[PDB]
């Protein structure tokens, strides 16, 4: 059933990959056609935990759930503000596994400006993901959108194959952090 996006996020040696129930929250998977082409000639695929679930010392991840999703994705974590402050997260990870790793992440778009304050506190936020071959900076967009699949939010996901030895993450708000990663070979 579940499509490639829902399987990688969590809603066999073979060269054949066979309108399902995919993607709780509405959004898009950047470079979706490229990721599917890389999984056609997949020799080995496995999931190993990456950034820790409890690592978010000053950030809360127990409230990240959407009623249109029924909870949230298991591979990623939806970080919400703790108490009344949202400090800038500066998390980094270096690939210690021998095989190639696939790390994904997402950025959530709020409904309006009042929700942006009620969730991530900081008005102007950003999400900067850095690797050895990419330099991206994503700024979330806020606009009134018609409800899709139950709610009016949006989430834009990304991905990048990681070489041994480092992904640097930096976000000041509206950032769906990864909890687990996929190691390909």
């Amino acid at each position: 059933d579940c499509s490639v996006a829902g399987w990688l996020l969590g809603n066999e040696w073979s060269y054949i990959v066979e309108p399902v129930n995919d993607l709780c929250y509405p959004g898009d998977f950047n470079d979706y056609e490229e990721l599917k082409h890389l999984l056609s000639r997949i020799n080995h695929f496995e999931k190993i935990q990456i950034i820790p679930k409890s690592s978010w010392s000053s950030h809360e991840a127990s409230l990240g759930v959407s009623s249109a999703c029924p909870s949230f994705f298991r591979n990623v974590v939806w970080l919400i503000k703790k108490n009344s402050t949202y400090p800038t997260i500066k998390r980094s990870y270096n690939n210690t596994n021998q095989e190639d790793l696939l790390v994904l992440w997402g950025i959530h778009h709020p409904n309006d400006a009042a929700e942006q304050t009620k969730l991530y506190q900081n008005p102007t936020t950003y999400i900067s993901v850095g690797t050895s071959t990419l330099n991206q900076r994503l700024v979330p967009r806020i606009a009134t959108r018609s409800k899709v699949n139950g709610q009016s939010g949006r989430m834009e996901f990304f991905w990048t194959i990681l070489k041994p030895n480092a992904i640097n993450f930096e976000s000041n708000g509206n950032f769906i952090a990864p909890e687990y990663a996929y190691k390909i070979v």
Partner: antibody
Amino acid sequence: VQLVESGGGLVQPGGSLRLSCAASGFTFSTYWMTWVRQAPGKGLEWVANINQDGGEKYFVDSVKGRFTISRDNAKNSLFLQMNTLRAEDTAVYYCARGFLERLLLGRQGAYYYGMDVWGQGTTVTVSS
Amino acid sequence: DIQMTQSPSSLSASVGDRVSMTCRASQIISSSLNWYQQKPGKAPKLLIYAASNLQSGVPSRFSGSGSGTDFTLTISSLQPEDFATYYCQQSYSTPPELTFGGGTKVEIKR
């Protein structure tokens, strides 16, 4: 959140006119704009689109090159000049605003458009 | 240019029946379509965004379904307040061009 279309009237065949759509209520510079016309007693027909930044604007082919569509985010309004009106252009012109998503529902996803705020519209009868 | 074909043009049903209409496309438009309700002499109103998803303000009677080529819009229990013409709008070529289909007029029998 209200849209007001103005600029309609009687235009002789071969003349020109300009429509005026004023926005009020919502942030105007963050949403696309769309004109939609409805012939008397007939169905809806799309006219034009304009991006948030006034630099990308598609057209409805049948009236391509006949008239241009411009906007001014400062004055919070959308324009629609008209030139060389034929008899088939006599219709009620609706002004609507809609957000342009890129959601991926299903196996593969494309662009998704949806107009949610519609104006009253001004009748533009173009006859002799 | 994408071509939409909605059927039937006219319709008549008593207050309380189950009315349903179809809107087919000449090209696979995925689930990128919209439904609109236009009262006589008024402005159209957004009902269904991307097939099954609903918009705030629409009663629970309306519901849309379909995926790919042709789609269907079904009304639970037809009420006398639902007398209007219902169009379907394309969205697969949203940047370049969307094509409205010839709506399906709904009339009430009493």
